[PDB]
Amino acid sequence: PFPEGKVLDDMEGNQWVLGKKIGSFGLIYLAFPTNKPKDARHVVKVEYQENGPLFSELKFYQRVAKKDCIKKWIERKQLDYLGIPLFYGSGLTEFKGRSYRFMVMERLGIDLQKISNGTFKKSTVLQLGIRMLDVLEYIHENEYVHGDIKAANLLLGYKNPDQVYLADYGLSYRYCPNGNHKQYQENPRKGHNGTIEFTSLDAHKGVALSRRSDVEILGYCMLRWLCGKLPWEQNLKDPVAVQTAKTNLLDELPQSVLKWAPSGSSCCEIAQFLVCAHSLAYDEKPNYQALKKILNPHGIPLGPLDFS
Ligand SMILES: Nc1ncc(-c2ccc(S(N)(=O)=O)cc2)cc1-c1cc(F)c(O)c(F)c1
């Protein structure tokens, strides 16, 4: 890999020093700015090899993760925070005989899969959804969809673990380049992509991801976080079976969702959400404010995330 203490030059002038390799479509290191540098509050993602998939993810961060754009959006929407990892820059570095691409990103805490089976308090499941909706509205406005929401790609902040961040934009897609929404085409060859437990129906058919697909995956997530299981989990080996089960579930809403819930818990809000989500056309803009009203109907403001 790359040795500790290596100095990297971003394309905005800045210099960064590598830290410990904290695991790994690219390698992840802790990062320190040389200027006004204690504990690492930055992270570096470095390309695995020549001509890799970093480009996709790199493009997204450069295009939409800039702090300027975010701070402006937060003011316009009156939001407390927006769960996108801050992007500090990217550049080129030479290891051995060739150049490599690296990203510099805000440091984050632990992911949700590690925290909790995977069952959280209902209050928490709903808040996670509401937070994810804000992130989705913003990225969707910027012509991009995530495509892989799951517990593993939601991370708490390092400095503030009260706040949560959607991570891992590798499988992200530009659905609306330059205001031109993609056409609908089913492709069996480019089919069943993403995490099978939560991938959208459009993904099962090889249709290019559009905004609704993100909303659908979130609904699946929230159901799994609340119930601890999904109907299709028994037969993940057959992706087609999974598509069938997802179709069935949505075809028979809301009882299908309601029946799934374990005694003593309710999936009422989640069932409505999937109802609202499954109503959408391929090119339709989700009603983010209605979806958020669904997950927090009373209108009491959100409290701190609870992982007790
Ligand atoms: N921004 C981040 N901050 C912290 C970690 C991290 C924390 C703890 C641990 S660990 N094993 O618990 O020590 C490992 C990694 C990872 C990312 C991150 C890496 C990527 F490659 C992404 O694409 C991405 F969106 C996010």
Cα separations in angstroms, 86 against 98, 106, 192, 210, 299: 28, 5, 31, 24, 29
This structure's resolution (Å) is 2.5
Whether 238 sits among the annotated catalytic residues: the reply is no
Neighbours of 305 (CB within 10 A): 19
Find the Cα–Cα–Cα–Cα dihedral 124, 287, 239, 184, rounded to 10°: -160
Q: Do 220 and 252 reside in the same domain of the chain?
A: yes
Cα-to-centroid distance, 133 and ligand 1 (Å): 22
Q: Do 69 and 129 reside in the same domain of the chain?
A: no
Residue with the smallest CA separation from ligand 1 atom 13 is 22
Which domain CATH number covers 130? 1.10.510.10
> Looking at the 3D structure of the chain, how many domains does it have?
2
Q: Do 60 and 132 reside in the same domain of the chain?
A: no
Q: How far is 236 from 70, CA to CA, in rounded Å?
A: 38
Nearest to 202 by CA among 229, 175, 177, 222: 175
What are the residues whose beta carbons fall under 8 Å from the beta carbon of 97, sequence distance 6 or more? none
Map the chain to HEC letters.
CCCCCCEEEECCCCEEEEEEECCCCCEEEEEEECCCCCCCCEEEEECCCCCCCHHHHHHHHHHHCCHHHHHHHHHHHCCCCCCCCCEEEEEEEEECCEEEEEEEEECEEEEHHHHCCCCCCHHHHHHHHHHHHHHHHHHHHCCCECCCCCHHHEEEECCCCCCEEECCHHHCECCCHHHCCCCCCCCCCCCCCCCCCCCCHHHHHCCCCCHHHHHHHHHHHHHHHHHCCCHHHHHCCCHHHHHHHHHHHHHCCCHHHHHHCCCCCCCHHHHHHHHHHHCCCCCCCCCHHHHHHHHCCCCCCCCCCCCC
Cα-to-centroid distance, 168 and ligand 1 (Å): 9
Q: Do 54 and 186 reside in the same domain of the chain?
A: no
End-to-end CA distance of the chain: 38
Please identify, among 108, 142, 170, the residue that sits at the C-terminal boundary of a domain: 108
Please identify, among 53, 83, 108, the residue that sits at the C-terminal boundary of a domain: 108
What are the residues whose beta carbons fall under 8 Å from the beta carbon of 43, sequence distance 6 or more? 22, 28, 29, 30, 31, 104, 105, 106, 107, 108
Q: Do 9 and 113 reside in the same domain of the chain?
A: no
Nearest to 173 by CA among 152, 198, 193, 197: 193
Give the length of the chain: 308
Q: How far is 130 from 80, CA to CA, in rounded Å?
A: 12
Q: Do 23 and 81 reside in the same domain of the chain?
A: yes
Q: How far is 64 from 58, CA to CA, in rounded Å?
A: 10
CA 266, 166, 32 angle in degrees (round to 5)?
145
Please identify, among 79, 108, 137, the residue that sits at the C-terminal boundary of a domain: 108
CA 288, 224, 77 angle in degrees (round to 5)?
20
Does the annotation flag 270 for ligand binding?
no
**Cα Rg of the chain, angstroms:** 20
User: Does the beta carbon of 154 sit less than 6 angstroms from any atom of ligand 1?
Assistant: no
Residue with the smallest CA separation from ligand 1 atom 16 is 108
User: Does the beta carbon of 164 sit less than 6 angstroms from any atom of ligand 1?
Assistant: no
Determine the longest span between alpha carbons in the chain, in angstroms: 61
Q: Do 103 and 134 reside in the same domain of the chain?
A: no
Q: Do 33 and 136 reside in the same domain of the chain?
A: no
* CA 114 to chain centroid: 16
User: Does the beta carbon of 292 sit less than 6 angstroms from any atom of ligand 1?
Assistant: no
Sign of the Cα torsion 215, 208, 282, 201 reads negative
For a mutational test of ligand 1's pocket, the pick from 21, 28, 165, i.e. the residue with the most ligand atoms closer than 8 A to its C-beta, is 28
User: Does the beta carbon of 28 sit less than 6 angstroms from any atom of ligand 1?
Assistant: yes
Q: How far is 158 from 42, CA to CA, in rounded Å?
A: 10
* CA 210 to chain centroid: 14
User: Does the beta carbon of 276 sit less than 6 angstroms from any atom of ligand 1?
Assistant: no
Structure determined by: X-ray
Q: How far is 203 from 173, CA to CA, in rounded Å?
A: 12
Q: How far is 100 from 83, CA to CA, in rounded Å?
A: 28
Does the annotation flag 27 for ligand binding?
yes
* CA 266 to chain centroid: 25
On the CB side of 187, CA atoms within 13 Å amount to 12
Question: How do strand 87-95 and strand 15-21 relate by DSSP bridges?
Answer: unpaired
On the CB side of 150, CA atoms within 13 Å amount to 15
Q: Catalytic residue among 10, 134, 148, 168, which?
A: 148
Q: What is the domain range of residue 125?
A: 109-308
Cis peptide, bond prior to residue 37, ω within 30 of zero: no
Neighbours of 156 (CB within 10 A): 19
Cα-to-centroid distance, 305 and ligand 1 (Å): 20
Q: Do 37 and 169 reside in the same domain of the chain?
A: no
Q: Do 136 and 65 reside in the same domain of the chain?
A: no
Q: Do 273 and 244 reside in the same domain of the chain?
A: yes
Q: How far is 44 from 29, CA to CA, in rounded Å?
A: 5
Q: Do 143 and 261 reside in the same domain of the chain?
A: yes
User: Does the beta carbon of 150 sit less than 6 angstroms from any atom of ligand 1?
Assistant: no
